[PDB]
Design a protein around this ligand. Structure first.
Ligand code: CHL
Ligand code: CLA
Ligand code: CLA
Ligand code: CLA
Ligand code: CLA
Ligand code: CLA
Ligand SMILES: CCCCCCCCCCCCCCCCCC(=O)OC[C@H](CO[C@@H]1O[C@H](CO)[C@H](O)[C@H](O)[C@H]1O)OC(=O)CCCCCCCCCCCCCCCCC
Ligand SMILES: CCCCCCCCCCCCCCCCC[C@@H](O)O[C@@H](COCC[C@H](C(=O)O)[N+](C)(C)C)CO[C@@H](O)CCCCCCCCCCCCCCCCC
Ligand SMILES: CCCCCCCCCCCCCCCCCCCC(=O)O[C@H](COC(=O)CCCCCCCCCCCCCC)COP(=O)(O)OCCN
Ligand SMILES: CC(/C=C/C=C(C)/C=C/[C@@]12O[C@]1(C)C[C@@H](O)CC2(C)C)=C\C=C\C=C(C)\C=C\C=C(C)\C=C\[C@@]12O[C@]1(C)C[C@@H](O)CC2(C)C
Ligand SMILES: CC(/C=C/C=C(C)/C=C/[C@@]12O[C@]1(C)C[C@@H](O)CC2(C)C)=C\C=C\C=C(C)\C=C\C=C(C)\C=C\[C@@]12O[C@]1(C)C[C@@H](O)CC2(C)C
Lengths: 41, 196, 223, 209, 77, 226
């Protein structure tokens, strides 16, 4: 597991994990909530 | 000096020997340290004394036929004259609450600055004007009696709360129900105390 | 050791030199290799047998009196509904609450005595009468449970009494299992089934009824 | 020296047989690091215990439904439970979430530092709420049990992990043949006993096209 | 309000990048840490960056945020 | 020294282990109080946030409690600004905000200059001769005219007990005010009405039941009901 998780920790996988996390977060915000323009609570 | 066993053949604990009301009851090693044990003893004493006060308040209001204990604080909702022993005290609800909070705040303030572990259980002196505690045998006997009557007062107060949660009838009506129809009307026939 | 559950079978090593009434080497799964497990399972089998002995007594003797016509008592499988529907009926919730509370009080004493044998004789516990509640042997408390005094005899009579008790208890347990199976299969009481087997032995058979062995009736109609 | 998951196989080096139910089945090399080995042991134990609890509850409810008592199916039980439950949805899940978060970070920081909660920080108890083994606590959670004896404790550990794995298999079987049959597991069992030669996983239409 | 909303997250990324750069530089062959990320320290710093402006202000006054140009590579003009 | 722990089993920061503090529980995962007088400044920030939160919460509950008892017709805290301003004895909002800002700047200017140099406000002939007692004996604990009853000139073991009681009730009122704004944001009612609703009906009156705090959870309830 150590030998594989060392590869898992390199930049291309980090280039996915942050990308998947932030992308999916923005998809769920734009999905459950409609498209707004004003931050009036 | 054990007063009995809560279970016949119970495993004896190494801490419940020199305490009043000792039955080795503690099943889950609560208060294993002495510093927590003394605080737990003091807190159990305070709950038992307040339970005696509550049981007396809920019983003298009913053996004298002056109303129900749950119906007593309803005067703050409807807004009529409060009544204690048929005297009709004219104090406002805000006034009695405001004097109550400061009065027992000062009372528990003088209770809290004791700094003596033995003084946090039984004060003596000014709180013991009649003074039947001069001899140690009667002192230990009365300690045991106080703790036992307080424990049953505590479970009686919790029974009052549960019984009023289930049925609207008071303690005396519940006693009449058990004396009239014990098998046909009890806690099992409510349907809200137990499911099904 | 006396007899054998299966003559010629290999005996487990934990029952060869065991001193216990009714030991026949019946443990192919070796569930009682541990001595504490053996003690717990002995107590469990003892209480199961005792409750089954009351069960088959209350099933058979009122059934025999019904067959003789002395009493109008009903069958065991429908006795619950005819008591629930009666006018002097304690409610079912109250009944099982009372039963659970009383038997929990009994079985707490039983468990606390099983943990430490003879530890229930601590003075000033059960209002002074607990001094005879000490256990002489695991599963056999004695005391007020034997007031007439047949257990205060020679030991060679006592193990025979234990053997008779455990044998009639196992007979009662398998009889209650048979009662449940016969009610689930035929829908009648043990007295009716016994009368039918005595009158018509071949026609009143478990193989004739299709509940016990499904698919056997289709073979009979095919033949 | 031990019965493996496949006879003649090579057991892993990190699976030396010192764990409960250590049959040496690990082709994906998980739990290789000792910290993750402990985390996998904890996860297997808690998933196993919850699988057994859920399977036992499902079986009890289905048996009670089959005997004539009014009980729901193992599926959509909560859907018809909430309409009669005094506690509404939302508050119930959040209450159980807060309480289980309390218990689970308590046992989590017990897993990180063994004996960390045995200092009397929680209501002044020292012997209780202290982990005895990797995924096995002590004090309050062993009221009468025989974990004091080492051999009986090891046998109970093996029995617990084997029953847990059997319960995981039971739960996946439950969801699979519920999606296959839309019936209770006890109903499926009675159908299998009633007609074993025909009623099976093959003649249900779905899952065999 | 979106101005301060973005600046909070923008300062969040800048702060956790700075702390990771500082932490990795005090380690043997720090160039490998940029291409071989470590998860527990980066995730710990990721969840310890909510108070980024509070860490930024205290480092500004005491010189840990900035650096005097006597150890800074400067052009030879 | 160290008393209690905010999270048993968690790794305590090195700057919080041997530190003599009022109400220290090791709660600093972000290591913001690592530097020494930086923690002194944030100690004063915690003390001055809590002290105005104590007065703010007491100004919300005690008038709110008396409103429930019917003694006073004091309105709720969220609408109290519009109640006073629309009244016929109203100082204008611009005058009130300027007076509040001017008075606090003078007060916090003395508090600030005390922090940079401790005891610097005791210079003679500055505050008309009464500044001799304006010397702070401890950072965030000035004393002098601020303790005229002599309730701080006691045994040292009682002083940190009072300091621990101050920070504990201070933090408790401080999360209370966040609850007060959140409960007005979600339910639109005062804390007294919210407390009575939870006491009389706990299950149906929950922040999870209200859709404002957790969006989409009410749709889960509606989908499960259908
Ligand atoms: C800094 C603390 C502070 C807080 C938390 C509040 C809270 C609030 N102010 Mg009060 N105020 C504060 C500053 C001050 N206000 C006032 C005097 C007023 C006025 C004059 C009014 C508010 C009112 C309001 C509300 C405006 C939002 C709303 O509901 O509109 C939607 C809100 C509950 C308004 C109100 O009560 O609306 C119902 C209102 O009319 N504030 C003064 C005196 C200068 C303040 C000084 O710090
Ligand atoms: C740099 C310029 C810029 C700016 C200011 C915005 C900002 C916005 N755009 Mg635009 N957009 C941009 C570039 C930009 N985008 C680009 C380059 C593209 C092409 C890929 C788009 C394509 C695009 C589409 C097609 C849509 C938007 C929408 C939006 C809104 C969604 C904000 C959001 O995710 O919810 C807010 C997110 C958060 C609060 C994140 C929370 C993070 C933590 C938890 C706090 C917001 C007003 C959507 C919208 O609402 O329309 C008005 C929409 O329909 N934009
Ligand atoms: C079952 C009742 C009971 C008993 C037996 C005791 C016994 C004792 N208490 Mg206690 N006490 C009780 C209830 C009781 N208490 C309650 C309810 C309170 C709360 C108000 C207190 C508050 C209290 C304080 C503050 C102190 C004691 C102390 C004592 C000790 C000596 C007091 C003495 O000489 O009079 C013995 C008391 C009785 C025999 C109680 C008789 C109850 C009356 C007759 C009933 C009246 C109720 C009425 C009918 C309604 C002794 C161990 C002292 C101590 O710690 O020891 C030095 C002490 O300082 N008690
Ligand atoms: C108080 C809320 C709370 C918190 C803080 C946790 C936190 C945790 N749980 Mg838990 N869980 C919760 C509620 C919670 N759970 C509830 C309500 C259930 C339903 C019964 C579960 C069922 C559950 C299982 C079945 C497992 C966890 C596991 C875990 C760990 C994995 C965390 C992760 O990767 O994400 C973590 C310690 C895993 C674990 O302990 O692995 C070591 C694991 O296997 N949890
Ligand atoms: C039957 C499976 C089983 C087994 C063999 C064990 C065995 C063990 N567990 Mg474990 N446990 C289980 C299930 C089980 N557990 C479940 C489901 C939970 C979640 C509630 C736990 C929670 C748990 C904790 C929190 C701890 C243990 C500990 C222990 C050890 C104590 C030894 C002991 O007392 O024996 C246990 C003996 C049994 C459990 C047998 C009793 C089985 C009963 C009779 C089944 C009937 C009840 C059931 C609800 C009815 C089903 C009805 C159905 C037919 C419809 C031992 C390794 C302790 C430990 O390791 O400390 C060192 C410890 O701290 N376990
Ligand atoms: C977090 C690390 C970090 C920080 C604190 C800075 C800070 C700075 N950069 Mg630099 N930059 C970075 C990374 C960083 N940069 C990277 C990775 C690149 C390559 C794409 C650049 C390319 C770059 C250029 C070309 C310029 C700057 C400039 C600047 C300054 C303007 C502020 C700004 O937003 O620039 C804007 C920065 C960007 C547009 C780069 C965005 C790239 C992402 C956001 C960085 C990702 C870092 C990563 C998440 C950190 C790892 C986290 C850790 C937990 C693992 C400021 C001194 C400008 C300058 O000189 O001003 C004086 C300028 O001209 N930067
Ligand atoms: C769950 C979140 C991710 C794991 C958190 C724990 C963690 O990082 O442990 C740390 C472990 C092992 O930790 C290792 O320790 C080594 C010795 O110190 C080195 O520092 C390695 O760099 C480090 O990764 O790594 C992982 O768990 C890697 C997680 C996977 C890679 C990042 C996420 C990618 C997501 C997209 C791809 C998969 C889908
Ligand atoms: C927590 C709250 C998490 C967020 C829940 C949000 C909640 O509004 O969503 C509801 C459906 O309404 C919104 C639909 C959506 C939209 O129009 O934007 N659209 C794009 C999916 C059309 C779910 O209703 C059912 O679909 C529930 C299905 C199972 C859910 C399992 C997780 C439940 C939560 C755990
Ligand atoms: C759904 C169950 C999967 C089997 C479906 C199936 O057998 O359908 C056959 C044609 O459809 C198919 O072959 C459809 C396959 C995918 C669905 C017709 O089968 P049949 O009744 O003509 O079978 C007698 C020939 N041996
Ligand atoms: C203080 C108290 C009663 C107070 C009563 C008051 C103020 C009464 C006042 C009024 O009524 C009047 C007169 C009239 C009414 O019109 C108005 C009110 C105001 C209502 C009861 C405590 C009552 C307290 C109770 C019942 C406590 C029960 C605790 C249990 C069962 C715990 C079991 C344990 O076993 C565990 C689980 C773990 C083991 O280690 C050990 C332990 C800790 C023992
Ligand atoms: C099967 C399972 C996991 C299986 C994993 C496998 C085979 C993995 C295999 C490998 O990893 C190994 C071993 C080694 C690696 O080298 C290689 C691979 C190949 C990767 C988990 C089940 C896990 C199953 C669990 C935990 C079940 C829990 C059930 C609960 C809680 C029930 C709750 C209920 O709510 C319901 C659902 C409905 C209501 O009607 C009733 C109640 C009771 C309310």
């Amino acid at each position: 597991m150590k030998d594989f998780t060392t590869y898992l920790s390199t930049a291309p996988v980090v280039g996915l994990g942050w990308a998947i996390f932030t992308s999916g977060l923005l998809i769920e915000i734009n999905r459950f909530f409609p498209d707004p323009l004003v931050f009036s609570f | 000096t054990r007063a009995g066993n809560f279970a016949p053949g119970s495993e004896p604990k190494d801490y419940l020997e020199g305490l009043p009301g000792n039955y080795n009851f503690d099943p889950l090693e609560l208060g294993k340290e002495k510093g927590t044990l003394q605080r737990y003893r003091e807190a159990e004493l305070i709950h038992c004394r307040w339970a005696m006060l509550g049981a007396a308040g809920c019983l003298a209001v009913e053996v004298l036929g002056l109303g129900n204990w749950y119906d007593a604080p309803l005067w703050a909702v409807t807004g009529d004259k409060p009544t204690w022993f048929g005297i009709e005290v004219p104090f406002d609800i805000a006034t009695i609450l405001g004097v109550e909070v400061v009065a027992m705040a000062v009372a528990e303030g003088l209770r809290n600055e004791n700094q003596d572990m033995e003084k946090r259980l039984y004060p003596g002196g000014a709180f013991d004007p009649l003074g039947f505690s001069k001899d140690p045998k009667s002192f230990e006997d009365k300690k045991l009696k106080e703790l036992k009557n307080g424990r049953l007062a505590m479970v009686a107060c919790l029974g009052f709360a549960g019984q009023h949660a289930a049925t609207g009838k008071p303690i005396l009506a519940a006693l009449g129900d058990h004396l009239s129809s014990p098998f046909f009307n009890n806690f099992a026939t409510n349907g809200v105390s137990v499911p099904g | 050791m006396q007899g054998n559950w299966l003559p010629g079978s290999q005996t487990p090593a934990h029952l060869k030199d065991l001193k216990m009434a009714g030991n026949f080497g019946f443990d192919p799964l070796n569930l009682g290799a541990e001595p504490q497990a053996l003690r717990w399972y002995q107590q469990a089998e003892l209480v199961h047998s005792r409750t089954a002995m009351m069960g088959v007594a209350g099933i058979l003797i009122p059934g025999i009196f019904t067959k003789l016509g002395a009493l109008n008592v009903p069958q065991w499988y429908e006795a619950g509904k005819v008591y629930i529907e009666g006018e002097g009926a304690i409610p079912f919730g109250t009944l099982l609450m009372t039963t659970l509370f009383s038997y929990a009080f009994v079985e707490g004493k039983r468990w606390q005595d099983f943990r430490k044998p003879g530890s229930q004789a601590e003075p000033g516990t059960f209002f002074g009468l607990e001094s005879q509640f000490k256990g002489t042997e695991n599963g056999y408390p004695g005391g007020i449970f034997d007031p007439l005094g047949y257990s205060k005899t020679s030991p060679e009579k006592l193990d025979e009494l234990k053997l008779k008790e455990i044998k009639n208890g196992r007979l009662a347990m398998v009889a209650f299992l048979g009662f449940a199976g016969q009610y689930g299969a035929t829908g009648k009481g043990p007295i009716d089934n016994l009368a039918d087997h005595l009158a018509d032995p071949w026609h009143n058979t478990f193989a004739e009824n299709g509940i016990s062995v499904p698919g056997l009736s289709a073979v009979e109609q095919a033949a | 020296d031990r019965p493996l998951w496949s006879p003649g196989s090579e057991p892993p080096a990190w699976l030396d047989g010192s764990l409960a139910g250590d049959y040496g089945f690990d082709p994906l090399h998980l739990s290789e690091e000792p910290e993750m080995r402990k985390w996998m042991v904890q996860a297997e134990l808690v998933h196993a215990r919850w699988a057994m609890l859920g399977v036992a509850g499902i079986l009890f409810t289905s048996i009670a439904a089959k005997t004539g008592a009014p009980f729901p199916d193992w599926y959509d039980a909560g859907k018809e439970a909430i309409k009669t439950s005094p506690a509404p949805l939302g508050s119930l899940i959040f209450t159980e979430l807060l309480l289980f978060g309390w218990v689970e970070t308590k046992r989590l920081y017990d897993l990180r530092n063994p004996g960390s909660q045995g200092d009397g920080s929680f209501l002044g108890i020292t012997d209780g709420l202290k982990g005895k083994e990797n995924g096995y606590p002590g004090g309050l959670f062993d009221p009468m049990g025989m974990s004091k004896n080492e051999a009986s404790y090891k046998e109970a550990k093996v029995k617990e992990i084997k029953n847990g794995r059997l319960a995981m298999l039971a739960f996946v079987g439950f969801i699979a043949q519920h999606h296959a049959t839309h019936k209770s597991p006890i109903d499926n069992l009675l159908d299998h006993v009633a007609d074993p030669f025909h009623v099976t996983f093959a003649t249900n239409g779905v899952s065999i096209p | 309000i979106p101005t301060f909303g973005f600046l909070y997250v923008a300062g969040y990324i800048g702060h956790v990048g700075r702390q990771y750069i500082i932490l990795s530089k005090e380690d043997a062959k720090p160039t490998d840490k940029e291409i071989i990320l470590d998860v527990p320290l980066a995730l710990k710093l990721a969840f310890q960056g909510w108070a980024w402006p509070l860490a930024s202000i205290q480092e500004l006054r005491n010189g840990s945020l900035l650096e005097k140009d006597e150890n800074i590579t400067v052009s030879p003009r």
